[PDB]
Amino acid sequence: LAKMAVAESGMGIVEDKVIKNHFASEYIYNAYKDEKTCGVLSEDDTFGTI
Amino acid sequence: KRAENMLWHKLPKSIYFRRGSLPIALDEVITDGHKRALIVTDRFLFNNGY
């Protein structure tokens, strides 16, 4: 994917789009690895909020 | 002549009560400047999240 974006646009270094495509796929996975986004996020029993 | 013994009606300064007024009453002792608290519980109430 880094070699196609320099063959298409011709405005970058091919070695720098490697660690930018790597940042966008394993650092985005690592920060949001276990983050509740689908079901019940929080729940309070003393105040009664879900 | 006969006189009667002085009676009284002595209570705590605040008797807070409803269904879920534990954290709303605990916010009063926060705003009174209390910074160090000791909690005396039973052995069952500590092992069950009370």
Length of chain A: 50
Residues B17 and B26: beta-carbon distance below 8 Å: no
Give the gyration radius of chain A's Cα atoms. 20
State the Cα angle at B20 between B27 and A48, rounded to 5°: 100
- The residue behind tokens 């705590």 is B12
Buried b / exposed e across A14-25, counting CB within 10 Å, b at 16+?
Answer: eeebeeeeeeee
Helices and strands counted in chain B (H then E): 3, 0
User: CA-CA distance, A50 to A44, in Å (whole number)?
Assistant: 6
What is the 8-class DSSP label of residue A46?
A: T
* CA neighbor of A40 nearest in space, from A50, A30, A25: A50
Whether the CB of B22 is below 8 Å from some CB of chain A: the reply is yes
- Kindly provide the resolution of this structure in angstroms, with one decimal: 3.5
Selected residue of A45, A46, A47, A49 to mutate for chain B interface (largest B Cβ count, 10 A): A46
How far, in Å, are A17, A20, A27, B36, B37 from residue A14 at the CA level?
5, 10, 20, 60, 62
User: Phi, psi (5° rounding) for residue A28?
Assistant: -75, -30
The structure was resolved experimentally with: cryo-EM
